[PDB]
Write a protein that binds this ligand. Structure first.
Ligand SMILES: Cc1cc(-c2ccc3c4c(cccc24)COC3)nc(N)n1
Length: 209
């Protein structure tokens, strides 16, 4: 059973600005997704101090980068706190706690897209390189869900079965045809070293089979 939702207007406008603005420095999407993973990892690490059973779904706190040239996908996996169904819909479909409004105003007052992370909307930079994004998430308090969007004002949410994660989030980027450089090992290594060298969790770049 697939549920379809409309993005809150300001979120649809933000995605459209990301998709339509001529902006060449697209590589920043990776540090923005890695930053979200690091924050989710900080949250599970903190909660598990006072409740060690929150780690029964997995003790390892890490980030995995999975390129796949055959599928034309780049996946960012973490074992962070994850999102419940309600967190998934609110965080991704609405302004929520974000600085969506300030970011859009900032862009008219001289800011540039690389500054997206200052406004709690870095996830949307995924749309600089991806035609479609699939988000698989498992929080300790809920079942596993798949969120999906190719923009155009809507997104879907369904339960996800058959490949259960213990806990965390998987951001699957179905890359645009001209954005395949982001599947190259030396390109990924270069971006991680340039923008994510200070992340306090291991970042493993998977090798293709
Ligand atoms: C628990 C969690 C949440 C997020 C996340 C995804 C997408 C959006 C987020 C926002 C705020 C906080 C976290 C996220 C707002 O923009 C979308 N990412 C990861 N990796 N993990």
């Amino acid at each position: 059973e697939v549920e379809t939702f409309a993005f809150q207007a300001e979120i649809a406008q933000l995605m459209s600005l990301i998709i339509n603005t001529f902006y060449s420095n697209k590589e920043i999407f990776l540090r923005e997704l890695i930053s979200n993973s690091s924050d989710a990892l900080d949250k599970i690490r903190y909660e598990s101090l006072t409740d060690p059973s929150k780690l029964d779904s997995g003790k390892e706190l890490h980030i995995n980068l999975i390129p796949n040239k055959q599928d034309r996908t780049l996946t960012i996996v973490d074992t962070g706190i994850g999102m419940t169904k309600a967190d998934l819909i609110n965080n991704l479909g609405t302004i929520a706690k974000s600085g969506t409004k300030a970011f859009m105003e900032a862009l008219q007052a001289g800011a540039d897209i690389s500054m997206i992370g200052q406004f709690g909307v870095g996830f949307y930079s995924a749309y600089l390189v991806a035609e479609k994004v699939t988000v698989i998430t498992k929080h300790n308090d809920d079942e596993q869900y798949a969120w999906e969007s190719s923009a155009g004002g809507s997104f879907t949410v369904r339960t996800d079965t058959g490949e259960p994660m213990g806990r965390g989030t998987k951001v699957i980027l179905h890359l645009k045809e001209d954005q395949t450089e982001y599947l190259e090992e030396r390109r990924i290594k270069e971006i991680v070293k340039k923008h994510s060298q200070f992340i306090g969790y291991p970042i493993t770049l998977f090798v293709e089979k």
